[PDB]
Swiss-Prot record:
Reaction it catalyzes: Hydrolysis of (1->4)-beta-linkages between N-acetylmuramic acid and N-acetyl-D-glucosamine residues in a peptidoglycan and between N-acetyl-D-glucosamine residues in chitodextrins
EC number: 3.2.1.17
UniProt name for this protein: Lysozyme C
GO BP term, example: killing of cells of another organism
PANTHER family associated with the record: LYSOZYME C (PTHR11407:SF28)
Chief localization: secreted
GO cellular component: cytoplasm; endoplasmic reticulum; extracellular space
CDD domains given in the database record: LYZ_C
Active-site residues from the entry: E35, D52
Tissue specificity annotation: In the egg white and polymorphonuclear leukocytes.
Gene3D superfamilies the record matches: 1.10.530.10
Keyword annotations from UniProtKB, A to Z: Allergen, Antimicrobial, Bacteriolytic enzyme, Disulfide bond, Glycosidase, Hydrolase, Secreted, Signal
Amino acid sequence: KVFGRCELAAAMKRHGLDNYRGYSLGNWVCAAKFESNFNTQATNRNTDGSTDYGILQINSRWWCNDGRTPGSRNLCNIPCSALLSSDITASVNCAKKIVSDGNGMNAWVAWRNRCKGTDVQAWIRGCRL
């Protein structure tokens, strides 16, 4: 499902990511746009031999079960393809838990150096929540 600028963020707030762990929604908009660029079906081969799933590019290395990974942990206790669905609540529901380790949005490479240090509100300006 191709997500619009106005479409995705509106859901993430309903999705209960709005200011979640003090992280402003614009981060959540921006991060999605940097990891899969509003593509929910987005999956990628991690070089270390695991795979990225979900619009939030959630790494199957220990988060989910993609059926190709030895030593996968599955902490989120979901199949990886539930991250690829037209419902945001699967991806979001384990992204909450990714910050739920308290190890920050530093789990996402894209926010990490390309979405920090900028105007945060700039994703959610001109859209209604």
